[PDB]
């Protein structure tokens, strides 16, 4: 309600009043699965290209590279910058294990 958007602040000049509508819904701030999936396929093809060309460059992919593809790819592009990541590549069958964690 507009009545609860009014606030007042007092200084030496006196009391000054100000105003500022719908609250945001959770369903507008999370990308739908379809767009997520197509973006994942795009981003990971792009990463394949960048990784092969950087292997030609003989360097490692940096933060400034892929920065336009940061929060994208269902296996999130951020996961190529984790520290344990090399040990994560030895964690096999984690999803079955997670679906069996409710059981213990």
């Amino acid at each position: 309600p507009q009545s609860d958007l009014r606030w007042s602040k007092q200084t030496d000049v006196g009391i000054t009043h100000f105003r500022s509508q719908l609250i945001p819904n959770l369903y507008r701030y999370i990308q739908p699965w379809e767009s997520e999936f197509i973006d994942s396929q795009r981003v990971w093809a792009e990463y394949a290209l960048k990784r092969q060309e950087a292997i030609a460059q003989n360097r490692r992919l940096t933060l400034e590279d892929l920065e336009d593809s940061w929060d994208r790819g269902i296996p999130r592009i951020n996961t190529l910058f984790q520290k344990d990541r090399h040990t994560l590549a030895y964690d096999k069958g984690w999803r079955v294990r997670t679906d069996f964690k409710q059981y213990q």
Binding site: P24, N25, Y27, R28, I30, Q31, P32, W70, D71
Partner: peptide, 27 residues
């Protein structure tokens, strides 16, 4: 103007599931 939530069915014609969905920048 009651404070109870209203069923979103029928009040979402002007929005998409991703409108206002933003991705954070590298830290």
């Amino acid at each position: 103007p009651t404070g109870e939530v209203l069923s979103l069915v029928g009040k979402l014609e002007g929005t998409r599931m991703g409108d206002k969905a933003q991705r954070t920048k590298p830290q």
